[PDB]
Coordinates of N, CA and C in Angstrom, one line a residue:
X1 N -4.5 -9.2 -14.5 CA -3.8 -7.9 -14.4 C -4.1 -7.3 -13.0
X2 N -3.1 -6.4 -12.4 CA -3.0 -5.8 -11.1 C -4.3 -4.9 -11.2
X3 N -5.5 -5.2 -10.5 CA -6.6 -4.5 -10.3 C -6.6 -3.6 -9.2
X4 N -6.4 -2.2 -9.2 CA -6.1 -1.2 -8.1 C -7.2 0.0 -8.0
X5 N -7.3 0.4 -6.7 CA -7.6 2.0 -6.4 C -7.2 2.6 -5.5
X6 N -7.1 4.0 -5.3 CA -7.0 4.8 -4.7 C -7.3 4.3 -3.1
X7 N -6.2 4.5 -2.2 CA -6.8 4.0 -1.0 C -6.6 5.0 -0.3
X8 N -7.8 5.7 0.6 CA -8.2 6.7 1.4 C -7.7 6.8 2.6
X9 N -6.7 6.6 3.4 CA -6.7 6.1 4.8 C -6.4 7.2 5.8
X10 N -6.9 7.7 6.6 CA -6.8 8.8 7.5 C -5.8 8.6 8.7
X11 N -5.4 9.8 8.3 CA -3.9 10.1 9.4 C -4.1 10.0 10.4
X12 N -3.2 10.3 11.4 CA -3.5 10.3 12.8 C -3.7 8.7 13.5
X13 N -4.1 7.6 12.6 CA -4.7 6.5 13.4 C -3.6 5.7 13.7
X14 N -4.0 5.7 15.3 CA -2.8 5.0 15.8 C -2.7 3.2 16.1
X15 N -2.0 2.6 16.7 CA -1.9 1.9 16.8 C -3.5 0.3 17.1
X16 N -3.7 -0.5 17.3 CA -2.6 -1.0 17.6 C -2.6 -1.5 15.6
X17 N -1.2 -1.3 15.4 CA -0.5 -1.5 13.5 C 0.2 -3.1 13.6
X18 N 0.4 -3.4 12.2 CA -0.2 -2.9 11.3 C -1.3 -3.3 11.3
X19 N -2.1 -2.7 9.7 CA -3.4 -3.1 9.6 C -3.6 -3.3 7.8
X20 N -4.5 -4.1 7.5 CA -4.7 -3.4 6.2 C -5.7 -2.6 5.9
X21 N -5.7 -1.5 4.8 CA -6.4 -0.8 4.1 C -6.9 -1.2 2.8
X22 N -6.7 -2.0 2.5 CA -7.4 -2.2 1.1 C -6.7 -3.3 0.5
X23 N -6.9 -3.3 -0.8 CA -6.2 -5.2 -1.3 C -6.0 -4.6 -2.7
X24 N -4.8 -5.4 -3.3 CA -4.1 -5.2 -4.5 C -4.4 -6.4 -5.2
X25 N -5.4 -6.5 -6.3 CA -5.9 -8.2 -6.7 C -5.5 -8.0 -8.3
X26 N -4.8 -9.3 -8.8 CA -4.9 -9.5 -10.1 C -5.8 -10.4 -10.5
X27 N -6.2 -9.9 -12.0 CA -7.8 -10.6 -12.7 C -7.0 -11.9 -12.9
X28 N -6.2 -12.0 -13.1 CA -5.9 -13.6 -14.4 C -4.4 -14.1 -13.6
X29 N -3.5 -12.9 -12.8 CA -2.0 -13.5 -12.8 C -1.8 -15.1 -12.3
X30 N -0.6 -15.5 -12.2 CA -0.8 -17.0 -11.9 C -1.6 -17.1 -9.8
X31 N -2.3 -18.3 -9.5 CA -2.5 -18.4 -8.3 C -1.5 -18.3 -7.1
X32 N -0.1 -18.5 -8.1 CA 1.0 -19.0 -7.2 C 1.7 -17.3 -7.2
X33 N 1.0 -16.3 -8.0 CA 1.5 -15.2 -7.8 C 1.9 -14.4 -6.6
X34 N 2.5 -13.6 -6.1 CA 2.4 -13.2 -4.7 C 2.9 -11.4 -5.1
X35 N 2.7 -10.3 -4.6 CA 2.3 -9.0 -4.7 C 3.7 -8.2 -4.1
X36 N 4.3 -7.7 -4.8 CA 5.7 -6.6 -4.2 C 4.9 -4.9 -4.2
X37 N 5.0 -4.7 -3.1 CA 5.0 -3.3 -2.7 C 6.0 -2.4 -3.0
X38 N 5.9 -1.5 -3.0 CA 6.6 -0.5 -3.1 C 6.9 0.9 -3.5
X39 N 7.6 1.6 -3.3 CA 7.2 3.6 -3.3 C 7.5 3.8 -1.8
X40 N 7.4 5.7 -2.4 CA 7.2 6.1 -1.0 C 6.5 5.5 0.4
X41 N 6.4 5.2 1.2 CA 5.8 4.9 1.9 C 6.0 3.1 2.1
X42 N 7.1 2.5 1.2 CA 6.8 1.1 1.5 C 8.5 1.6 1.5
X43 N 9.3 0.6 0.2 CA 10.6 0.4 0.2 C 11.3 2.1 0.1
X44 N 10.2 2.9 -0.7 CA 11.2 4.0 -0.6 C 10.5 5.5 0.4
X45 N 11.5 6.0 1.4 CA 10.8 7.2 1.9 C 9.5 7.2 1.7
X46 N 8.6 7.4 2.9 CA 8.9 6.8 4.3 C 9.0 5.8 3.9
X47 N 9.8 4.9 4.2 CA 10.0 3.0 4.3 C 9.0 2.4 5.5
X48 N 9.0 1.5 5.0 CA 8.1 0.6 5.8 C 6.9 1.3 6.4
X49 N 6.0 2.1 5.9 CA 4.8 2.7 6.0 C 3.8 1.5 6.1
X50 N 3.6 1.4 4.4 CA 2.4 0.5 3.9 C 3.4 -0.7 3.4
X51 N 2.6 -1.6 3.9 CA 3.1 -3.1 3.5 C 2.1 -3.9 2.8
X52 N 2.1 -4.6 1.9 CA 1.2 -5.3 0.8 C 1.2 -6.9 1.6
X53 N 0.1 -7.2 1.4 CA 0.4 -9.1 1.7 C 0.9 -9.5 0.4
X54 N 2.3 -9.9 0.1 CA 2.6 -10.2 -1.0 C 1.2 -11.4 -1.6
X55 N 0.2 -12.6 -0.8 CA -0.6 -13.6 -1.3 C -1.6 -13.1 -1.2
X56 N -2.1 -12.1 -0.6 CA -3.5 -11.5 -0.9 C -3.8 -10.2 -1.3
X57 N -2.7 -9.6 -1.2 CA -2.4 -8.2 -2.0 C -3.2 -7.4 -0.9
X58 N -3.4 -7.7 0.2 CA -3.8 -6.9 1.5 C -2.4 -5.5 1.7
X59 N -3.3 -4.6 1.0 CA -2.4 -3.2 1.5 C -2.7 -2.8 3.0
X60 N -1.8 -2.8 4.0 CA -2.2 -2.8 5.0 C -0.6 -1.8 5.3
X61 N -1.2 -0.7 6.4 CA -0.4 0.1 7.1 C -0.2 0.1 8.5
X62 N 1.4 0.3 8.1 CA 2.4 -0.2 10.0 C 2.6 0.5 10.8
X63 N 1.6 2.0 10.6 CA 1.9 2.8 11.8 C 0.8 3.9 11.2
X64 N 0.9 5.3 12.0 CA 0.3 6.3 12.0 C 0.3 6.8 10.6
X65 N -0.1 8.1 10.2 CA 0.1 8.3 9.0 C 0.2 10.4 9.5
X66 N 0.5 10.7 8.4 CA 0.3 12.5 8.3 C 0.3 12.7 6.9
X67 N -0.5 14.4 6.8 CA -0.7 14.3 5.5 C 0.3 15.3 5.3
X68 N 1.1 15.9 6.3 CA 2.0 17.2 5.6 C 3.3 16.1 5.1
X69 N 3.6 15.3 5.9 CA 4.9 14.4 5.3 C 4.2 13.7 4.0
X70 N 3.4 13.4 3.8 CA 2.7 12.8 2.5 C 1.3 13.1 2.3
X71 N 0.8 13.6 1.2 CA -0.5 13.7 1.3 C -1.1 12.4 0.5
X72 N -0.3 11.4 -0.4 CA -0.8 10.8 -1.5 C 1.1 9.6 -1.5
X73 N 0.9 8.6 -0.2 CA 2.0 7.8 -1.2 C 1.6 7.1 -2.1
X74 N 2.4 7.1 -3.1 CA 2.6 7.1 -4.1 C 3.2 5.0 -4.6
X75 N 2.6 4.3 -4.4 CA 3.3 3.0 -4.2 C 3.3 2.6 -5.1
X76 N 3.7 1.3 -5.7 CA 3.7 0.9 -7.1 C 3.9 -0.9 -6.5
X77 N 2.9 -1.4 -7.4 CA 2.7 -2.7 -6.5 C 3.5 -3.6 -7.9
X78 N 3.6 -5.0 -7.9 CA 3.9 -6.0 -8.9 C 3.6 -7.3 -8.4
X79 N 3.3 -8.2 -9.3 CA 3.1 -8.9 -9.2 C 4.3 -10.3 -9.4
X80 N 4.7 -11.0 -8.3 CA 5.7 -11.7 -8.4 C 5.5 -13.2 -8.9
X81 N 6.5 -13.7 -9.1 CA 6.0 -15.2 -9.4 C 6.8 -16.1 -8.0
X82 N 6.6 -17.3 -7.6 CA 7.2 -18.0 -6.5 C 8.8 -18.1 -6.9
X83 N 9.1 -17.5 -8.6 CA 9.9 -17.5 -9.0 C 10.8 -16.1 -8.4
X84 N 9.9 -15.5 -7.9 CA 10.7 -14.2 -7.9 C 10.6 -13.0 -8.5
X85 N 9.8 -14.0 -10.0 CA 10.3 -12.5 -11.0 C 9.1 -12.3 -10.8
X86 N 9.2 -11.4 -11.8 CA 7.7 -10.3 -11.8 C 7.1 -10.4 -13.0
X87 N 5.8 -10.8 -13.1 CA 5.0 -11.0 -14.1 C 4.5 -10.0 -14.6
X88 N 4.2 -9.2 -13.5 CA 3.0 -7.8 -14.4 C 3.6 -6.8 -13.3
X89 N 3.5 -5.3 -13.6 CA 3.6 -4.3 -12.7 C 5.3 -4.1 -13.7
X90 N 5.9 -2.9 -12.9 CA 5.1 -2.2 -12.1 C 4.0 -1.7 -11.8
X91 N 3.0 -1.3 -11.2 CA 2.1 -0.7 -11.2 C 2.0 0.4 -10.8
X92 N 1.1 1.4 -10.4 CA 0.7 2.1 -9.3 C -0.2 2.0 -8.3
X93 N 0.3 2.6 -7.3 CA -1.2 2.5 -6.3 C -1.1 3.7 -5.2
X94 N -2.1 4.2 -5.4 CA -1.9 5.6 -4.3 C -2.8 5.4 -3.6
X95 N -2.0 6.0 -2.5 CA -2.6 6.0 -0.6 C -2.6 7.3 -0.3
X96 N -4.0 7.8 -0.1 CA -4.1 9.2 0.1 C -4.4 9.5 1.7
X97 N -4.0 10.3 2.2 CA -4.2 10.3 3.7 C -5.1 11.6 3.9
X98 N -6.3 10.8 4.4 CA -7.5 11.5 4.7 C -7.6 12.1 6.1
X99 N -8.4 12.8 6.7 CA -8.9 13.5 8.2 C -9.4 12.4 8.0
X100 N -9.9 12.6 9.9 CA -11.5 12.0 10.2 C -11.9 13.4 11.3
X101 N -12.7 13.6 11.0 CA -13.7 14.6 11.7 C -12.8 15.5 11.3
X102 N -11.6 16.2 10.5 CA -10.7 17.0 10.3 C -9.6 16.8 11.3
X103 N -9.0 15.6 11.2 CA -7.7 15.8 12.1 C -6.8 16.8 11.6
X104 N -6.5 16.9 10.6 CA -5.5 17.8 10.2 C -5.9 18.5 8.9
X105 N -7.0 19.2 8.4 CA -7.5 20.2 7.1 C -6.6 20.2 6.2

């Protein structure tokens, strides 16, 4: 099953993107499984934000972030088969956009 948390990642950080933040892992799904992203901030508003490694479930982000345009995207991950389809998920997974030293309170 899609094993998730809350990913922290602070605004403002810039390049050089993408990167990943965190990893999207299932306990049991098949090996051949591979990971669909999506929500705000991936397929829907902002798009192409956070991108998942569909094979290692690496949530990783493609650019800067802000917390007044989002304070919490909102993603929803799945787990795919080589088939395409989707075995488990939708899920959730939220990306909270944090300060560092208070970029933005």
């Amino acid at each position: 099953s899609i094993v998730v948390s809350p990913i922290l990642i602070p605004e403002n950080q810039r390049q050089p993107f993408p990167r990943d933040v965190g990893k999207v892992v299932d306990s049991d799904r098949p090996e051949r499984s591979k990971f669909r992203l999506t929500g705000k901030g991936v397929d829907q508003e902002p798009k192409g934000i956070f991108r998942i490694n569909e094979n290692t479930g690496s949530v990783s982000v493609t650019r800067t972030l802000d917390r007044e345009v989002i304070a919490v995207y909102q993603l929803f991950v799945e787990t795919t088969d080589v088939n395409g389809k989707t075995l488990e998920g939708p899920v959730p997974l939220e990306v909270i956009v944090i300060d560092q030293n208070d970029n933005r309170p």
